[PDB]
Nucleic acid binder design. Structure first.
Ligand SMILES: *C(=O)[C@@H](N)Cc1ccccc1
Ligand SMILES: [Mg+2]
Lengths: 143, 29, 238, 29, 165
RNA sequence: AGUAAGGUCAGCUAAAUAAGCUAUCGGGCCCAUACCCCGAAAAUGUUGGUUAUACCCUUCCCGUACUACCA
RNA sequence: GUUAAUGUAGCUUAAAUUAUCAAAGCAAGGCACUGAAAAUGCCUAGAUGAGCCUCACAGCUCCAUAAACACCA
């Protein structure tokens, strides 16, 4: 009776002393479905004319990538300077509002935003019905 | 600058073939 | 107080709705990346059925000793035809809406791949100048709230916009002309706050004569060189 | 009986505090 | 030697961190969650969710590399476990369902350290502007509940917890 | 004081392959109870370490045991 | 227009026909490499602000950066 509660308390502590296991990521673990299922491509043939243009194009891509970084780094530099100069300028004129503008205000997080889509959502669209089953292979282990 | 990350590849060594599939949302997007 | 007039301006920005077109250089590399994916990949289940047709067809040509003539019903190529016919029959929206064709610089359905910054026309000194929405700072009110109040003062608006913390994003100082310049009010200081438009739009009462939406490329046309310079600093090109 | 060094110490320029801010070597070469 | 002027020329333990070894019995992710500084936000999780594995990871790398250039400390770049949903569509002229397709969701999280309040507007401006296509950005606080999804389920405790209640 | 030495189901025992008997809970047999037949549940004093645990060691606690002599 | 600060690549070396072998070093990028970084391999892009003076010291000036008197709603 009272002793059985003691074991129930102790069984709680015994499981607590164990490590908190983490679910392995199946994305990084290829299943045995692709494990040498004769699904090998034939020996790839690379034309010499295709090889020279492919490597030469990658040289421009490296140069073009640097161009994107230069403008992006310049853009964030100007944005950082513009906000920094305005914040300091306002401090001298209105010291009281400067403290409010710099203190951590929980009015931003969470900041959930989605990315743009290929096409805009059309007007008066009626998608068909159905149901969403979630297999989500479970991983339960005991110690 | 919305085309600065979509240009990529499935960085793996043992992966099945993938095909471009245009999925439409609940709306027309 | 101070001779300068404290004003809180709101820099409302609309995020792009559609993906921007790929540059010619990016198109060539996108083909290359997709080409490499197929070369370094394995055979998918659909690609397996392509050889399954070859396995059965080869029997139908030489090894006419197949045990079971039932087999399947559909074919891998036929399956693609089933989805192709539905896809070709099905139609989507247009990236370039009627707003672009009619140059309706007020509706939110223009330049879906670009960013639109809200501009309104205010009459000061018997002169109409296009400017960002703004309001005067008041006692017992933070500068961020002044821009927040400006959104509620818009003519018949239901828009919901997320602000960005409390720190400002820019400044602009101007002095009144000497005709109306006094020591009491030498000029004013305009502070800009950026916000992202989530949902909502203006009503149908007044559109052309109240507000317009433009991108940074044509933003300078409606503005003036003195006021334009400070606006472009915090406006991230996109 | 500690003595005073005759010149600057080798590693006294860097700040002991705030180790994470200082960039590391990350390489052997 | 102590009395020589060249004493302590070999001092190095104050240059590297202590680097406490992960003891077998003391192995625990002891994270001192910082909350509410004068100008520094707390620990934040940048949840990037997308349907395509390649697209989700590609933008995850950009966020992680951007923080390093901006001197933003990155505590970890772990990955939330994936979730698979079976898409079933309704058959026309009927009621019985049929297997339409199998779609999965991939989530990549780039945990970041504290940042200045001024930089919060600028840093987030770059992120949301570069969302390639359909990536669901989610910048939420790093509470233990948001971090529990990475671990497994423990029915052994739930058997005891149910009887405890 | 020192040394020796033990704790296991409600209870007592044997093994560490955690079992056996009894008690307890449910049902059957009988006019009813008990006997009897059938079924189920139940624990390794405590902390830490023992590849990992258990019989082990360690810590904590309860209780048991011997000796304390020559002037 | 006018009044006061500055102008080799991102910082910085040598250099700056002052002489000398020479425009350097580190950053910053692409690709490959268990998944992130980082290492490693292969690989991309480059400035001596401008003229004058000195031609055998190097600086002035110009222009520009940039602040100011100061046009502004
Ligand atoms: C602008 O040029 C001025 N007319 C603005 C103005 C100042 C004071 C009173 C009214 C208008
Ligand atoms: Mg890497």
């Amino acid at each position: 009776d009272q002793a059985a509660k003691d074991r129930l308390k102790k069984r709680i502590r015994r499981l607590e002393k164990a490590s908190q296991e983490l679910i392995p990521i199946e994305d990084f673990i290829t299943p045995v479905k692709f494990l040498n299922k004769e699904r090998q491509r034939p020996p790839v043939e690379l034309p010499f004319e295709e090889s020279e243009r492919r490597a030469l194009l990658l040289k421009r891509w490296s140069l073009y990538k640097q161009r994107e970084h230069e403008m992006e780094r310049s853009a964030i530099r100007s944005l950082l300077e513009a906000q920094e100069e305005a914040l300091q300028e306002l401090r001298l004129s209105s010291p009281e509002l400067h403290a409010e503008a710099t203190k951590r205000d929980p009015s931003l997080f969470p900041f959930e935003r989605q990315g743009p889509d290929y096409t805009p959502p059309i007007s008066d669209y009626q998608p068909p019905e159905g149901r969403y089953q979630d297999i989500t292979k479970v991983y339960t282990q005991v110690e | 600058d919305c085309n600065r990350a979509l240009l990529t590849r499935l960085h793996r060594q043992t992966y099945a073939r993938l095909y471009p599939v245009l999925l439409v949302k609940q709306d027309g997007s | 107080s101070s001779p300068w007039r404290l004003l809180g301006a709101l820099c409302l920005q609309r995020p792009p709705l559609v993906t921007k077109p790929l540059t010619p250089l990016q198109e060539e590399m996108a083909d290359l990346l997709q080409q490499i994916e197929i070369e370094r990949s394995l055979y998918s289940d659909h690609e397996l059925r392509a050889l399954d047709e070859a396995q059965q067809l080869a029997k139908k040509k030489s090894d006419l000793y197949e045990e079971e003539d039932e087999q399947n019903i559909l074919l891998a190529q036929d399956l693609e035809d089933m989805w192709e016919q539905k896809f070709l029959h099905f139609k989507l929206g247009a990236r370039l809406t009627e707003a672009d064709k009619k140059d309706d610089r007020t509706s939110l359905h223009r330049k879906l791949d670009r960013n639109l910054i809200l501009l309104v026309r205010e009459k000061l000194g018997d002169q109409d100048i296009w400017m960002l929405p703004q309001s005067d700072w008041q006692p017992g009110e933070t500068l961020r709230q002044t821009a927040e109040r400006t959104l509620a003062t818009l003519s018949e608006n239901n828009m919901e916009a997320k602000f960005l913390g409390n720190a400002p994003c820019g400044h602009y100082k101007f002095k009144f002309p000497q005709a109306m310049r006094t020591e009491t009010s030498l000029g004013a200081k305009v502070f800009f706050f950026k916000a992202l438009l989530l949902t909502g739009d203006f009503s149908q009462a007044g559109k052309k004569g109240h507000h317009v939406w433009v991108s940074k490329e044509e933003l300078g046309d409606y503005l003036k060189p003195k006021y334009l310079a400070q606006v472009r600093r915090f406006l991230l090109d996109l | 009986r500690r003595a005073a060094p005759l010149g600057p110490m080798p590693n006294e320029d860097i700040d002991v505090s705030d180790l994470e801010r200082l960039k590391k070597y990350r390489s052997f070469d | 030697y102590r009395s020589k002027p060249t004493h302590g020329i070999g001092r190095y333990k104050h240059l590297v961190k202590a680097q406490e070894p992960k003891k077998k019995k003391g192995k625990v992710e002891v994270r001192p969650i910082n909350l509410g500084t004068d100008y520094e936000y707390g620990v934040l999780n940048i949840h990037l969710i997308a349907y395509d594995m390649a697209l989700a990871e590609s933008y995850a790398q950009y966020v992680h590399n951007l923080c390093n250039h901006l001197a933003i400390k990155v505590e970890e770049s772990y990955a939330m476990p994936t979730k698979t949903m079976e898409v079933l569509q309704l058959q026309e002229q009927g009621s019985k369902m049929f297997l339409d397709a199998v779609l999965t969701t991939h989530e990549r999280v780039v945990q970041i350290s504290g940042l200045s309040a001024t930089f919060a507007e600028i840093f987030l401006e770059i992120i949301h502007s570069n969302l390639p296509e359909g990536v669901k950005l989610s910048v939420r606080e790093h509470t233990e509940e948001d971090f529990k999804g990475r671990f497994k389920a423990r029915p052994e405790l739930e058997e005891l917890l149910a009887k405890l209640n």
